[PDB]
Design a binder for this molecule. Structure first.
Ligand SMILES: CO[C@@H](C(=O)O)c1cccc(OCc2ccccc2Cl)c1OCc1ccccc1Cl
Length: 130
């Protein structure tokens, strides 16, 4: 849709702090911190796929809007994820061990803007089309 495409990370703010708030240790934060992933979003029927690709780590999820799914995150959390589309924003929540984190993806001008919140920490990541 508005989201379908291949997107390259061009800026990131507070990602280390976000990872730390998730309880990510040093080695894994080091890997995530200066990574500049591509995110490839595609849709087929009811099923959206989001692939994230980087030199040291790749992940992929496929999901139906509103349908909870099991996910293993890049930092090896085992989470229950639900993704809905609200006012043009793809809203993802991940729930695990009585915690939650949200990942909101929106389109703004030429940007795919990704807001990641854990407790009091808010990270903003910006991607542009490859
Ligand atoms: C999946 O989309 C992106 C985005 O929208 O910026 C996104 C949203 C939320 C958490 C993310 O990584 C959480 C992480 C990543 C690495 C280490 C610890 C953690 Cl805790 C993330 O990047 C996914 C990633 C980032 C860098 C490298 C590969 C990947 Cl696979």
């Amino acid at each position: 849709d508005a989201f379908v495409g291949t997107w390259k990370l061009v800026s990131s703010e507070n990602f280390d702090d976000y990872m730390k708030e998730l309880g990510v240790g040093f080695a894994t934060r080091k890997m995530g911190g200066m990574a500049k992933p591509n995110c490839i979003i595609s849709v087929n029927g009811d099923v959206i796929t989001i692939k994230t690709e980087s030199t040291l780590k790749n992940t992929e999820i496929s999901f139906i809007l509103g349908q909870e799914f099991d996910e293993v995150t890049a930092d090896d959390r085992k989470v229950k994820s639900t993704i809905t589309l609200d006012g043009g924003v793809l809203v993802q929540v991940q729930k695990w061990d009585g915690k939650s984190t949200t990942i909101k993806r929106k389109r703004e001008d030429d940007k795919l803007v990704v807001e990641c919140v854990m407790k009091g920490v808010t990270c903003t990541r910006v991607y542009e089309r490859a």
